[PDB]
Amino acid sequence: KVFERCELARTLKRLGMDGYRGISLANWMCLAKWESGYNTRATNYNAGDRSTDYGIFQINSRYWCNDGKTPGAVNACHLSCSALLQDNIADAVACAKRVVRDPQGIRAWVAWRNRCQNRDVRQYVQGCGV
Numbered sequence: 001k002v003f004e005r006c007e008l009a010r011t012l013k014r015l016g017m018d019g020y021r022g023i024s025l026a027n028w029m030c031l032a033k034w035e036s037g038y039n040t041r042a043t044n045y046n047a048g049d050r051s052t053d054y055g056i057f058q059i060n061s062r063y064w065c066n067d068g069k070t071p072g073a074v075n076a077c078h079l080s081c082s083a084l085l086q087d088n089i090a091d092a093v094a095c096a097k098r099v100v101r102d103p104q105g106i107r108a109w110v111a112w113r114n115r116c117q118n119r120d121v122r123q124y125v126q127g128c129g130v
């Protein structure tokens with residue numbers, strides 16, 4: 001489904017995203033908005049490296065989840081990319097959390113760098129009571 005800004009702010013809050021390894025809730029809100037527009041069913045296919053980005057945080061099938069058709073997939077999140085298209089984002093979160101424990105951290109999402117990095121994200125969580 002498509003969350004509404006403030007439903008997602010509180011929901012991630014409950015899942016422990018605020019301050020998770022130094023990443024403020026607002027930063028996550030920003031990359032979720034630009035990567036998927038708050039949609040858990042979002043899916044983007046890269047014809048070149050035959051990989052697919054899934055769900056709300058647009059996590060890659062070559063490095064994180066398994067869809068059984070991406071050449072050279074390692075499945076670091078030990079998850080089915082399917083888990084990334086269901087309405088409950090519990091596993092989407094458990095995985096984005098694994099993603100940031102890599103050397104590059106939040107730099108793993110280009111939308112973050114383009115529209116979130118150095119563009120003050122205090123705007124996304126203000127009014128949600130988080």
Ligand SMILES: *[C@@H]1O[C@H](CO)[C@@H](O[C@@H]2O[C@H](CO)[C@H](O)[C@H](O)[C@H]2O)[C@H](O)[C@H]1NC(C)=O
Nearest residue numbers: 057058059060063064099102103104108109
């Ligand atoms: C987006 O794709 C990136 C490359 O396709 C990916 O970055 C790579 O992730 C690797 C994970 O084992 C490793 O950290 C490499 O150093 C890095 O280049 C990035 O993680 C992907 N982002 C998402 C959200 O899936």
Ligand SMILES: *[C@@H]1O[C@H](CO)[C@@H](O[C@@H]2O[C@H](CO)[C@H](O)[C@H](O)[C@H]2O)[C@H](O)[C@H]1NC(C)=O
Nearest residue numbers: 046104105106107108109110111112113114
């Ligand atoms: C999605 O974002 C990823 C990081 O924001 C990006 O992957 C990174 O690309 C770097 C290139 O200098 C380097 O290889 C990093 O190790 C890697 O994680 C990925 O390319 C972005 N998606 C697209 C389609 O560009």
